[PDB]
Every structure is written in structure tokens, then in C-alpha cells.
Design a protein around this nucleic acid. Sequence first.
RNA 1: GUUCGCGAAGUAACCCUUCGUGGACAUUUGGUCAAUUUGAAACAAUACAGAGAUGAUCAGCAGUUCCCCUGCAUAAGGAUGAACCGUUUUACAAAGAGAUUUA
Length: 157
Amino acid sequence: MPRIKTRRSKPAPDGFEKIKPTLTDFEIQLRDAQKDKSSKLAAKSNEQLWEIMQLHHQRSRYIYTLYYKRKAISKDLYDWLIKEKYADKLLIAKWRKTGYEKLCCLRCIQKNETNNGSTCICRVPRAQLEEEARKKGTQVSFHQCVHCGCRGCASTD
RNA sequence: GUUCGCGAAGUAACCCUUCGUGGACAUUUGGUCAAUUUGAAACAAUACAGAGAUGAUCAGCAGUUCCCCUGCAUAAGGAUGAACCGUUUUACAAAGAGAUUUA
Ligand SMILES: [Mg+2]
Ligand SMILES: [Mg+2]
Ligand SMILES: [Zn+2]
Ligand SMILES: [Zn+2]
Ligand SMILES: [Zn+2]
């Protein structure tokens, strides 16, 4: 029941046909992303992986707004879309929290993985990174987060 | 972006939107590493040389070196694995004899 339809898979509920054209359009953008473009550069190669983290994030904001913001789908369709692995359950669970409404991924708040026990730089608000920049006179030595290619996922931002 | 409070607007049995404000929430990724010739795989082929002792042909096993390869290996193999089988003058005098030689 995660991804391919088997006999143990339950039939889809009512509102799935109206959301299915957008979910098919995310699905074919991942297939172009999965394939290897033969890239010599190390900086181009993780740039391809950032497209996968973004395409994953956007399809989960799609199902999140349909149920928690617009209420356009029944809960029986939402429980089906979680079990059939359309929407990332643990990512939606942070989006419900306060301060985490626009979080890019779960790997960027995971403190144990960092050298310093900190969050990712993409979690720091753009007002604050501009401030110590004014101390130095140099703008920003930060463009994209190494694990996501996130330009800053903070709430105020 | 959410939420709490505040100040207004319009709708208004004070409710719904919208604008202006205070506080809260959330807080510093990654690299010892840049994408062909100029910071360092190897082999095969070719050319030369030829794989111990001995009168001669052979089983080998060691030790020594700022020598290794194969192997999980403290096993066993790798020409008995390889390189060593070259060069070597003073802790130095005692005894005597001749000759030279000087107060
Ligand atoms: Mg030997
Ligand atoms: Mg041997
Ligand atoms: Zn992230
Ligand atoms: Zn990040
Ligand atoms: Zn981020």
C-alpha cells in the first residue's frame, strides 16, 4: 500500500478524480528528476537532488492546503493519500506547529547531524542574517542550503 | 506565516473583513575534497641479461638488510622469493747492532 496498487490496496475515495490531474503532473516531473543527466561537476550533481527535495515539498503542500486550509477534501481521502504515500506525514506534522509553517524538509531541523548541534542556516530569518552583514559590509555569503537548495524557509520570511 | 493583545475603518445586537501597531513562536548548513594533459596505478610487447651449492645434476630450511609481492593468515608459496659471497695496515713497544751527529 505505499506506492504500487496491489490486492491489499483499498479503492480510492470520492474526491480523488478532481485532484488527480495535479498529482499526475507532479508525478511526471519526478520521473524527469530521477533519471541521470550525466554531469561532470560536483556542484551540478547535488543541484539535481535539490529538485527532488523541492518537488516532494510542493506535492505535500498541495494536499496540506486542500485539507487543513481549504477543506476541499474529506478526511477519508486524506487518510488514503497518507497511506498511499502521496503526502509526507512527518512533514505535514511540522507544518501544523508554530514556527515551522514553511519548513523545507526534516533534514534541516535535525540537530544531531550538524557539526555544532545547530539548525540549518536556512532556518535563520533573513532580517537577522542581513544584520551581522551590516557589521562587516559584505552582503550574504549564503545562497542555498546544502541539503535542500533552500533560500530560507523561516516563517517571517 | 500562525496566535495573543491594542488602535481604526466598512458591515455592523460588537460580528465578519481590511489597514496600521506591541509581544510571543522559529535561529547560523556545508568543505582536509573545484570539472581531461603539468604533483605522479600498473601491466603487456620489444631489447639485453639468465634461474644457489658443484667435478656435474638436484630436495630444500633458515639467519642478516633504512627489501618486498600473493594470501584471512602468527599457514604456505613467490629463482632454496630478492639483495648480501666485495674490501681489509697504528691502544703499539721492549732488547740489540751499525752508521750519522752534538754540549
Ligand atoms: Mg629465503
Ligand atoms: Mg620460502
Ligand atoms: Zn531542508
Ligand atoms: Zn537547510
Ligand atoms: Zn530550508
